[PDB]
Amino acid sequence: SWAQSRDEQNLLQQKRIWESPLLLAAKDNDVQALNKLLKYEDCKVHQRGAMGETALHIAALYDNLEAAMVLMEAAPELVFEPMTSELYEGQTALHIAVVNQNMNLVRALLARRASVSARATGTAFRRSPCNLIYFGEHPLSFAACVNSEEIVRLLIEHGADIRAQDSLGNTVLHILILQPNKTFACQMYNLLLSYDRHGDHLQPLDLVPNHQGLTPFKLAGVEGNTVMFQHLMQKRKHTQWTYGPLTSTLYDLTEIDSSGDEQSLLELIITTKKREARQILDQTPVKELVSLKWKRYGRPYFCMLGAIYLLYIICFTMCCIYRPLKPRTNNRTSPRDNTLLQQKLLQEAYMTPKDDIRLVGELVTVIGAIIILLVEVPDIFRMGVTRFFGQTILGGPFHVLIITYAFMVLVTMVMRLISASGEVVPMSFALVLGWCNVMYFARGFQMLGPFTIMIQKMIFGDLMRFCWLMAVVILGFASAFYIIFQTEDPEELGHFYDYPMALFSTFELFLTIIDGPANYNVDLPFMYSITYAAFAIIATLLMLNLLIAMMGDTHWRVAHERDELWRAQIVATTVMLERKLPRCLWPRSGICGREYGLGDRWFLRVEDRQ
Amino acid sequence: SWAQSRDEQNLLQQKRIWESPLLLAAKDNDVQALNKLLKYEDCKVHQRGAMGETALHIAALYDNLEAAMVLMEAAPELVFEPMTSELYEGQTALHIAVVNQNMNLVRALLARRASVSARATGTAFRRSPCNLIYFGEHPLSFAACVNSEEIVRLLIEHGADIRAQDSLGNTVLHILILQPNKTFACQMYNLLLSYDRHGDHLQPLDLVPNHQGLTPFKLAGVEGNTVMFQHLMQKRKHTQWTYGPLTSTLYDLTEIDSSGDEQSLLELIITTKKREARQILDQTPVKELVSLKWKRYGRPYFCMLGAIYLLYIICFTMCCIYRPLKPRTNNRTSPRDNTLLQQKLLQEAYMTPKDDIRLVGELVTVIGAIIILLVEVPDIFRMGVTRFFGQTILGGPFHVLIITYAFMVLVTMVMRLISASGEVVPMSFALVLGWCNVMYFARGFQMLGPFTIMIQKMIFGDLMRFCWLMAVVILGFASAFYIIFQTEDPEELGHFYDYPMALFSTFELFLTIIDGPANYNVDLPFMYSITYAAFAIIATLLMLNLLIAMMGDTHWRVAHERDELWRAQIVATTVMLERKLPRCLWPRSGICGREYGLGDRWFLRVEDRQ
């Protein structure tokens, strides 16, 4: 609906240029007709186009130097005119000649005092998925993104402000990081810092943030721009000595490490959705910083929490095993009734010293369930209650499973206080969610770490993508199997005696975890052998080994990038383990340079061999 | 804790150089300030640094030739000064200028009679995982490891001892093998043998061992340095004739083959932990030596021991089958009691001539169990009782299984002598350990050989790495399944009737080796169908085919290097079969050159075609 509208304006621009002889003579290189048109009476010079454009805009848009000079002589006030549309707001011909890199025509307008500070605020210039270029809003921003070193020098001599910000707060150094040609953006980055030295108006140009707060150093890590990230560490490192093939380099760790309350560079890479940002983790000062925090304070504090959680789940498991049960007080209803025991009442549950030992174990699992919710739930109140916490749901799925576990413990606490029947259903969820959260503590081991990335990408990328075709085949054949055996005696072959059982039987015959139905003492119905032969070929052979072959490719892809997926689990673990543990037991990383004559900041030394 | 300490000294070195004007003028190339400082009164010349360094140490460390010459004129006694720290003990500036390769400044110190024999015994020079360079302790050792042919010639002219040894006993030829650039180390190896000819003080420089006993020939094979190993066989081979495209080369086999009581080169490659050393086995005189020892005396003596072991295990199997059993004398306790027979007493066991035939077979399996322990156990007494024999445990795991088998035979010997109940548990271990040791004798066949390397790397690299996540899922769902059926009648569905059975049932439902529980005559509990549907998706589909896909990659990696893993099993078999068989039936390999005019050593001839 939006691409349909701006295709209708680009064809309407071409109709207006074919109707007006003034606009048509500016498209072609026709100075013969522009002499004849402009010598007429009043000429209709300031007429609009379909884009709100003037005739001097067309001459700069089609690289017509000779047509533009005729218009500037005959009408000198066309230079100060912006486009008055919606999709090209504020754009002048001084914007257009910069992008088309017409060196003779930029000097021509600036001789006629063209504005170097007009703001091209149209929707064909905002950072959008619909726009193929994001150049900024200023002509100095336009010339930097087209790699024109001659015009960037020529604009600053005429007064182009280098510290100007667009609607996103981005300076020209922020926009050069967002450009697709990364090697040419490094040379233009150096050139724009050569001119920023003049009596600093605030903190310098590479230290000015945008409306997100990011500096050009932190923006290169959020956007995954690894080429610019290496280029901006050269300002931040410092070589101490060089002993033959040795080199001792001292790195900054100011905007990388967690200085204060702001988000550090490690927090912004884990949070962001662009998965190109996780290549910053392989770059040198960040790579030895993560290994330093994990081997010193990360891994000891993580293996303590993993061992306290095992003793909690073993204490929870034995309270479910020794739960209060008594023989049933009523009598059996049907011959299909299998039940022999039922739950004791609350006053009846605690009446012996062995129930007092269990009550100690039940208070441990209730208090531990509250401590989980005191740590996890106040994060949804600080962050956004639905959306901005839902970003952490797709990031860490073990946040959900331990809040759901702690919910299930307090449900069967309430169902114990009031004497409620059916505590087996909140317990059974809590046993399997309680134990399968021990697979969270497998990222402390590099070999066991990305096994849970395999289990995740097989469920949410293979099973949740192919089970819609399996459920189609189960519903087809279970409905067939149900009406075949609908006229029969279930006491011989009872796999399909009602419709919910025929769906659970066909799910189990799909996966080949119960045997195929057979009696051999009675004549089975005729359609059964034909249907089950057709079922066993498409379900058990073909579609079951489809899924096993799909999951075998998910295994191969995760095991290939086995090292860089584990080291991104450690950054997410170390960052989480700082924002919840108190500061007195987490020392700050690196060597502080107060009593070494280096300032107030916190350095990190790397020694290598070339 | 150790890297944190020597980061604090490298920043403290930079503070002391910024405080003293004498040290700061030696870091920069400032001969203007060194003229003004040294013309003062007493100047504080011999002040220390944070590394125990002098001002003449800084000038050599930062490549300041002009700053160093001012210091040597004004203070000529700074040349004889070592660093008095702990981490740079004994290092002088004559060490530093050699590593930085400053040719003008090495001649300057040696003109002022600098010591060419000072020992840099600091912990930044010991062979350690923490040190990135191991250059030795002498300036001749430093110049050889930086590939400076001009300084090695210049040091020997001033009296550098070429036979000097560091704290590890390594000469300069030992250290050149330990260097990472292998091609440049070959040219420096040749240069240092050109100077060692002067009236040999002992056996020559390439034949002097270190405190481990290794010569530079044997050190290249232990360290896996295959480039230096080819370069040092050129001294050891000898071309007999060249008949067109043919060439007859006669190889040495002095330090390669088992000469006396010392460990040969074949014994040191199998023993060592660096698995780069097994590429020496593909090099020509070692490769045809292993094939010669195996095809002549290795494989006949190995197939005799494999056939005697089959007849021993078949004789052990029939003594377990015909074991003494009688009907039970007591009466049944419970309806769950299944037992119908029990063991006979010792006086009752041997009372017929068919028991006398078994007694012959039981003496064979007792005597054979003692002979295993007389061969295997006295190896743990000669080697280190815990640690240095534990190196052979990780090397050969079939040493453990045949000592454990021989232990299990003598347990049920003792349990037969005293009439002890429960001989089925030491026998059942001994049947499966007895028969699965026949897979030891599968390396005699090249096709069957590395099948047991597959079985090993799947157990100790896939199963012992993923079963911690399976046991989490088994304990989760077996605890869920136990409390679901805890209120039921076990006589219909008894898979989970107590907690140890529910763990063995869930282990068997994981692996899909028993069928899923179903009755269809009774109403099963409601949570069972939901839990077993969740179990059968994550356990049987997803996590069971994870492990099968992991083991499929272990198969692919071992089958790729199928030839070089079998030929390393033959070296370990041939070496083991020499140190236990007597010398009269193992002839020495090669042709001895006594009556061929070649000396006392033992050659091996290889004929090839180019």
Ligand SMILES: CCCCCCCC/C=C/CCCCCCCC(=O)O[C@@H](COC(=O)CCCCCCCCCCCCCCC)COP(=O)([O-])OCC[N+](C)(C)C
């Ligand atoms: C990888 C590392 C390895 C892990 C290994 C770890 C150990 C793993 C194994 C552990 C034990 C396994 C065997 C024990 C079985 C006997 C229990 C018992 O006697 O039950 C009694 C009740 O007791 C209960 O009801 C249990 C309640 C929870 C116990 C915790 C109490 C407070 C601990 C506070 C702090 C907790 C932790 C704090 C968390 C921060 C009564 O039962 P019974 O009448 O005697 O029944 C006997 C039946 N039988 C005769 C057939 C047997």
Ligand SMILES: CCCCCCCC/C=C/CCCCCCCC(=O)O[C@@H](COC(=O)CCCCCCCCCCCCCCC)COP(=O)([O-])OCC[N+](C)(C)C
């Ligand atoms: C990926 C997930 C998909 C799940 C797939 C499997 C679903 C599993 C869900 C299981 C939930 C079970 C809850 C309790 C069941 C009781 C009610 C019942 O269903 O049976 C009732 C029957 O009534 C029916 O026949 C309903 C089935 C209609 C067609 C199926 C539509 C399913 C939605 C399609 C979605 C499309 C998805 C794929 C397309 C994109 C009563 O059973 P009865 O006792 O035998 O009474 C017979 C009376 N008689 C004796 C007179 C004859």
Ligand SMILES: CCCCCCCC/C=C/CCCCCCCC(=O)O[C@@H](COC(=O)CCCCCCCCCCCCCCC)COP(=O)([O-])OCC[N+](C)(C)C
């Ligand atoms: C790849 C190569 C292929 C391998 C092939 C090799 C051969 C493989 C097969 C071999 C034989 C298989 C069939 C034999 C079954 C009859 C045995 C018997 O009669 O038992 C008798 C007792 O005998 C015993 O108790 C056995 C004790 C050990 C025997 C060794 C005696 C001393 C040998 C010293 C040196 C040993 C070696 C030294 C080691 C260095 C009594 O039993 P029974 O009352 O008669 O029971 C009959 C029941 N039935 C009627 C139903 C049947």
Ligand SMILES: CCCCCCCC/C=C/CCCCCCCC(=O)O[C@@H](COC(=O)CCCCCCCCCCCCCCC)COP(=O)([O-])OCC[N+](C)(C)C
């Ligand atoms: C890789 C290897 C791992 C193996 C995993 C599987 C272990 C296999 C080991 C099997 C050994 C079995 C030996 C004999 C069993 C008898 C005692 C018993 O356990 O049952 C007793 C129950 O008491 C319990 O419930 C204990 C279980 C507590 C929680 C499990 C902790 C396991 C350690 C976690 C380690 C974490 C490792 C993963 C995390 C990294 C008695 O049973 P009962 O007769 O039914 O009495 C019920 C009384 N009732 C009737 C009143 C209700």
Ligand SMILES: CCCCCCCC/C=C\CCCCCCCC(=O)O[C@@H](COC(=O)CCCCCCCCCCCCCCC)COP(=O)([O-])OCC[N+](C)(C)C
């Ligand atoms: C699916 C579930 C499976 C996963 C298990 C989850 C359940 C249990 C969770 C976690 C396990 C808890 C028990 C520890 C056992 C392993 C420890 C170990 O050997 O690691 C290191 C020793 O440790 C260190 O060198 C540094 C840490 C200090 C010791 C840990 C402190 C507390 C230990 C307990 C005191 C508790 C205090 C409170 C008392 C209750 C060895 O070095 P590594 O380098 O780490 O070697 C392998 C990693 N690698 C592959 C990277 C090379």
Ligand SMILES: CCCCCCCC/C=C\CCCCCCCC(=O)O[C@@H](COC(=O)CCCCCCCCCCCCCCC)COP(=O)([O-])OCC[N+](C)(C)C
């Ligand atoms: C009380 C018990 C229930 C409640 C407890 C908590 C339950 C919920 C737990 C965790 C929920 C936390 C969020 C989901 C986790 C990952 C989602 C994600 O990352 O994006 C995913 C899409 O997006 C989705 O698929 C969203 C999930 C929709 C279905 C949720 C129900 C599945 C329950 C689970 C039951 C499943 C049946 C298994 C057997 C039972 C993409 O996945 P990916 O990993 O980013 O990459 C894989 C794609 N790739 C392969 C192409 C590369």
Ligand SMILES: CCCCCCCC/C=C\CCCCCCCC(=O)O[C@@H](COC(=O)CCCCCCCCCCCCCCC)COP(=O)([O-])OCC[N+](C)(C)C
């Ligand atoms: C999991 C278990 C499976 C493994 C079986 C373990 C159990 C039994 C253990 C070992 C097997 C014992 C029986 C021998 C059968 C095979 C012999 C053979 O054919 O090999 C060679 C013949 O042999 C030779 O050419 C040289 C050796 C002389 C013959 C062996 C002497 C003793 C034979 C018995 C007298 C006993 C004396 C004491 C009396 C008791 C053939 O040449 P090859 O080159 O080797 O061909 C294949 C190898 N390749 C792939 C490299 C090309």
Ligand SMILES: CCCCCCCC/C=C\CCCCCCCC(=O)O[C@@H](COC(=O)CCCCCCCCCCCCCCC)COP(=O)([O-])OCC[N+](C)(C)C
């Ligand atoms: C009486 C009956 C019991 C006693 C009899 C004797 C029992 C003990 C027998 C042989 C023991 C001899 C030493 C182990 C052999 C190999 C170890 C090794 O090489 O290093 C290993 C690590 O290091 C370890 O894992 C050490 C082993 C720890 C567990 C030991 C108990 C397992 C028992 C066994 C039961 C398992 C369950 C199976 C079904 C039962 C590394 O393995 P790798 O091969 O070097 O390379 C593979 C890694 N790769 C794939 C990444 C490349």
Ligand SMILES: CC(C)CCC[C@@H](C)[C@H]1CC[C@H]2[C@@H]3CC=C4C[C@@H](OC(=O)CCC(=O)O)CC[C@]4(C)[C@H]3CC[C@]12C
């Ligand atoms: C009553 C007493 C004796 C028992 C103590 C209970 C502990 C076992 C609980 C209390 C708080 C719990 C912690 C609360 C929050 C978290 C964060 C949680 O983080 C995630 O799940 C990250 C998700 C992801 O990144 O995928 C991991 C478990 C952990 C450390 C919990 C581990 C278990 C703890 C220590």
Ligand SMILES: CC(C)CCC[C@@H](C)[C@H]1CC[C@H]2[C@@H]3CC=C4C[C@@H](OC(=O)CCC(=O)O)CC[C@]4(C)[C@H]3CC[C@]12C
């Ligand atoms: C009583 C019955 C009906 C309960 C049903 C249990 C399931 C709903 C639970 C139990 C096991 C759980 C799984 C166990 C482990 C994982 C791996 C876990 O992996 C990650 O989060 C990887 C990400 C990372 O670590 O980087 C994602 C959730 C998931 C699939 C869990 C999803 C929810 C599952 C299937």
Ligand SMILES: CC(C)CCC[C@@H](C)[C@H]1CC[C@H]2[C@@H]3CC=C4C[C@@H](OC(=O)CCC(=O)O)CC[C@]4(C)[C@H]3CC[C@]12C
């Ligand atoms: C495609 C691969 C997996 C195998 C290829 C062979 C199949 C197509 C063949 C092998 C056995 C055949 C079946 C053998 C016997 C029967 C039973 C017959 O039905 C009855 O006699 C019903 C019994 C009754 O009415 O009591 C119908 C054909 C059918 C299913 C045959 C269908 C074709 C089958 C499955």
Ligand SMILES: CC(C)CCC[C@@H](C)[C@H]1CC[C@H]2[C@@H]3CC=C4C[C@@H](OC(=O)CCC(=O)O)CC[C@]4(C)[C@H]3CC[C@]12C
């Ligand atoms: C009483 C009489 C009639 C029976 C003879 C008993 C033999 C069958 C036994 C006695 C000593 C045993 C040997 C003792 C030691 C070894 C070394 C052993 O070496 C390893 O296991 C290497 C381990 C590895 O490299 O993995 C292999 C079996 C072998 C030859 C044994 C094979 C079986 C032997 C010959």
Ligand SMILES: CC(C)CCC[C@@H](C)[C@H]1CC[C@H]2[C@@H]3CC=C4C[C@@H](OC(=O)CCC(=O)O)CC[C@]4(C)[C@H]3CC[C@]12C
């Ligand atoms: C009665 C029951 C409980 C006994 C249990 C038996 C297991 C503990 C045994 C029987 C089979 C054995 C395995 C059989 C064969 C091998 C291959 C073997 O492989 C090698 O040593 C390869 C190295 C090489 O040859 O180069 C290592 C031991 C291993 C895994 C064994 C380990 C111990 C196992 C699992």
Ligand SMILES: CC(C)CCC[C@@H](C)[C@H]1CC[C@H]2[C@@H]3CC=C4C[C@@H](OC(=O)CCC(=O)O)CC[C@]4(C)[C@H]3CC[C@]12C
């Ligand atoms: C993911 C792939 C492997 C298959 C995708 C389809 C499944 C998600 C569907 C197919 C059959 C369905 C089951 C069909 C019948 C039942 C029984 C129903 O429980 C009962 O009726 C219990 C019986 C009783 O209480 O007596 C609960 C839903 C459940 C487990 C369904 C859960 C969803 C299942 C497993």
